[PDB]
Design an enzyme around this catalytic site. Structure first.
Site, mmCIF file in Angstrom:
data_model
loop_
_atom_site.group_PDB
_atom_site.id
_atom_site.type_symbol
_atom_site.label_atom_id
_atom_site.label_comp_id
_atom_site.label_asym_id
_atom_site.label_seq_id
_atom_site.Cartn_x
_atom_site.Cartn_y
_atom_site.Cartn_z
ATOM 1 N N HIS A 61 7.719 -3.369 0.244
ATOM 2 C CA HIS A 61 6.830 -3.881 1.274
ATOM 3 C C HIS A 61 5.359 -4.047 0.910
ATOM 4 O O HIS A 61 4.567 -4.598 1.692
ATOM 5 C CB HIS A 61 6.937 -3.013 2.521
ATOM 6 C CG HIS A 61 6.792 -1.529 2.307
ATOM 7 N ND1 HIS A 61 7.790 -0.657 2.185
ATOM 8 C CD2 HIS A 61 5.589 -0.870 2.210
ATOM 9 C CE1 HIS A 61 7.229 0.515 2.015
ATOM 10 N NE2 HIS A 61 5.910 0.388 2.029
ATOM 11 N N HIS A 91 -2.833 0.845 -1.541
ATOM 12 C CA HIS A 91 -2.011 -0.359 -1.488
ATOM 13 C C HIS A 91 -2.786 -1.428 -0.734
ATOM 14 O O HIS A 91 -3.875 -1.171 -0.193
ATOM 15 C CB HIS A 91 -0.690 -0.079 -0.766
ATOM 16 C CG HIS A 91 -0.859 0.536 0.615
ATOM 17 N ND1 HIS A 91 -1.079 1.806 0.893
ATOM 18 C CD2 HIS A 91 -0.827 -0.176 1.799
ATOM 19 C CE1 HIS A 91 -1.187 1.907 2.190
ATOM 20 N NE2 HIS A 91 -1.036 0.715 2.732
ATOM 21 N N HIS A 93 -2.493 -5.036 2.015
ATOM 22 C CA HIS A 93 -1.720 -5.868 2.939
ATOM 23 C C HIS A 93 -2.340 -7.255 2.757
ATOM 24 O O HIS A 93 -3.575 -7.295 2.651
ATOM 25 C CB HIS A 93 -1.903 -5.354 4.377
ATOM 26 C CG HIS A 93 -1.279 -3.971 4.594
ATOM 27 N ND1 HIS A 93 -0.087 -3.694 5.093
ATOM 28 C CD2 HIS A 93 -1.891 -2.772 4.297
ATOM 29 C CE1 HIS A 93 0.056 -2.395 5.113
ATOM 30 N NE2 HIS A 93 -1.026 -1.843 4.636
ATOM 31 N N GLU A 103 -5.076 -6.116 8.492
ATOM 32 C CA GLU A 103 -4.409 -5.510 9.624
ATOM 33 C C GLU A 103 -5.404 -5.299 10.739
ATOM 34 O O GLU A 103 -5.182 -5.713 11.882
ATOM 35 C CB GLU A 103 -3.811 -4.189 9.211
ATOM 36 C CG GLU A 103 -2.813 -4.376 8.100
ATOM 37 C CD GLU A 103 -1.742 -3.319 8.163
ATOM 38 O OE1 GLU A 103 -2.060 -2.157 7.953
ATOM 39 O OE2 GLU A 103 -0.598 -3.677 8.413
ATOM 40 N N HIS A 116 -6.019 -0.222 1.547
ATOM 41 C CA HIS A 116 -5.900 1.091 2.178
ATOM 42 C C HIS A 116 -5.839 2.149 1.103
ATOM 43 O O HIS A 116 -4.958 2.094 0.234
ATOM 44 C CB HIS A 116 -4.634 1.173 3.016
ATOM 45 C CG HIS A 116 -4.623 0.297 4.254
ATOM 46 N ND1 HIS A 116 -3.485 0.011 4.841
ATOM 47 C CD2 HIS A 116 -5.700 -0.223 4.916
ATOM 48 C CE1 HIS A 116 -3.841 -0.697 5.897
ATOM 49 N NE2 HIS A 116 -5.141 -0.830 5.933
ATOM 50 N N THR A 195 0.441 2.170 9.610
ATOM 51 C CA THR A 195 0.703 0.865 10.193
ATOM 52 C C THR A 195 2.064 0.327 9.806
ATOM 53 O O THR A 195 2.376 -0.838 10.057
ATOM 54 C CB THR A 195 -0.400 -0.098 9.754
ATOM 55 O OG1 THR A 195 -0.284 -0.186 8.354
ATOM 56 C CG2 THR A 195 -1.803 0.340 10.124
ATOM 57 N N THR A 196 2.867 1.121 9.096
ATOM 58 C CA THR A 196 4.230 0.752 8.774
ATOM 59 C C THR A 196 5.080 1.912 9.312
ATOM 60 O O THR A 196 4.532 3.019 9.491
ATOM 61 C CB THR A 196 4.391 0.601 7.243
ATOM 62 O OG1 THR A 196 4.201 1.884 6.664
ATOM 63 C CG2 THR A 196 3.349 -0.333 6.618
HETATM 64 C C1 LIG Z 1 5.946 3.154 3.930
HETATM 65 N N1 LIG Z 1 4.506 3.352 3.711
HETATM 66 C C2 LIG Z 1 4.025 4.351 4.696
HETATM 67 C C3 LIG Z 1 4.591 5.761 4.335
HETATM 68 C C4 LIG Z 1 3.982 6.362 3.077
HETATM 69 C C5 LIG Z 1 4.668 7.663 2.650
HETATM 70 S S1 LIG Z 1 2.313 6.791 3.461
HETATM 71 O O1 LIG Z 1 2.258 7.768 4.523
HETATM 72 O O2 LIG Z 1 1.654 7.115 2.226
HETATM 73 C C6 LIG Z 1 1.728 5.336 4.106
HETATM 74 S S2 LIG Z 1 0.089 5.074 4.374
HETATM 75 C C7 LIG Z 1 0.364 3.574 5.113
HETATM 76 S S3 LIG Z 1 -0.922 2.724 5.870
HETATM 77 N N2 LIG Z 1 -0.558 1.015 5.863
HETATM 78 O O3 LIG Z 1 -1.039 3.079 7.249
HETATM 79 O O4 LIG Z 1 -2.100 2.887 5.067
HETATM 80 C C8 LIG Z 1 1.734 3.291 5.272
HETATM 81 C C9 LIG Z 1 2.531 4.336 4.707
HETATM 82 ZN ZN LIG Z 2 -1.585 0.107 4.531
#
Ligand SMILES: CN[C@H]1C[C@H](C)S(=O)(=O)c2sc(S(N)(=O)=O)cc21
Ligand SMILES: [Zn+2]
Ligand code: MMC
Length: 256
Positions: A61, A91, A93, A103, A116, A195-196
């Site tokens: 993703h 990462h 988006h 986002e 992020h 946000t995921t």
């Molecule tokens: C699937 N990805 C999620 C689970 C990972 C374990 S995590 O908690 O590191 C993060 S941080 C993140 S965000 N877009 O809010 O910065 C999304 C996610």
């Molecule tokens: Zn993120």
């Protein structure tokens, strides 16, 4: 399983993660005229000089650059935070077109991508325990807009051919996150969530006011990545962002 397409995208997530309709979900639109300036908010302290990057991974993703977090090497403190938060990964988006991708939005304006940098609160001992706490995580969000090339992003951009499909990874040592920071550290902050999925409401969002610029060709290589694993039908990794969620009585505070 969840994704960003028509059949498994953000609007379907509530079915498996009922917290999708919760009280402190992210991202939100930042309304600059309703955000309250808070004079007691301290300056941010970003100490990333001892950072140790390890790997970059395509997880189906987004792609994550992971860091060694077994010691206070790259930490974030100050700002609205109490305690030290360790950098574990960052990462992005991004969108299929330059006018969408972020986002968080500012006065409904969408940027081309959003960075992020994810940190967890050290008093909880490990990442898994930090996601059980309302102040367990702090994510630093930086907006990206198309313009001049950001030199510090190029090492990331060049390795992306090696992790084209889901589950591939590559060694990625000695990357320095300081090359992705804007000049100002003014920020907005509010309490939110991931946000995921799993959409856990454990996050203090610190969204920086100043965007960094990236070239059109730097953003173009992000779009060549695949959500699919090797040997499956190709689905370009674009538009991996969640629409803004209701602020629901939370206040967004500004350090400026
Ligand atoms: C699937 N990805 C999620 C689970 C990972 C374990 S995590 O908690 O590191 C993060 S941080 C993140 S965000 N877009 O809010 O910065 C999304 C996610
Ligand atoms: Zn993120
Ligand atoms: C409550 Hg995380």
């Amino acid at each position: 399983h969840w994704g960003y397409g028509k059949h498994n995208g953000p609007e379907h997530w509530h079915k498996d993660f009922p917290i999708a309709k919760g009280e402190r979900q992210s991202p939100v639109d930042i309304d600059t005229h309703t955000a309250k300036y808070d004079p007691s908010l301290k300056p941010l302290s970003v100490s990333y000089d001892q950072a140790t990057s390890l790997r970059i991974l395509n997880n189906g993703h987004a792609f994550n650059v992971e860091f060694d977090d077994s010691q206070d090497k790259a930490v974030l403190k100050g700002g609205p935070l109490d305690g030290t938060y360790r950098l574990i990964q960052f990462h992005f988006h991004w969108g299929s077109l330059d006018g969408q991708g972020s986002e968080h939005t500012v006065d409904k304006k969408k940027y081309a991508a959003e960075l992020h940098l994810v940190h967890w609160n050290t008093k909880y001992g490990d990442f898994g325990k930090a996601v059980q706490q309302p102040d367990g995580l702090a994510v630093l969000g930086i907006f990206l807009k198309v313009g001049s090339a950001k030199p510090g992003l190029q090492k990331v951009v060049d390795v992306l051919d090696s992790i084209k499909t889901k589950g591939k990874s590559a060694d990625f040592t000695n990357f320095d996150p300081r090359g992705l920071l804007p000049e100002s550290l003014d920020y907005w902050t509010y309490p939110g969530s991931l946000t995921t999925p799993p959409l856990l409401e454990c996050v203090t969002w610190i969204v920086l006011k100043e965007p960094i610029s990236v070239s059109s060709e730097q953003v173009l290589k992000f779009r060549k990545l695949n959500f699919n694993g090797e040997g499956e039908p190709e689905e370009l990794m674009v538009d991996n962002w969640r629409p803004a969620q209701p602020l629901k009585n939370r206040q967004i505070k500004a350090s400026f």
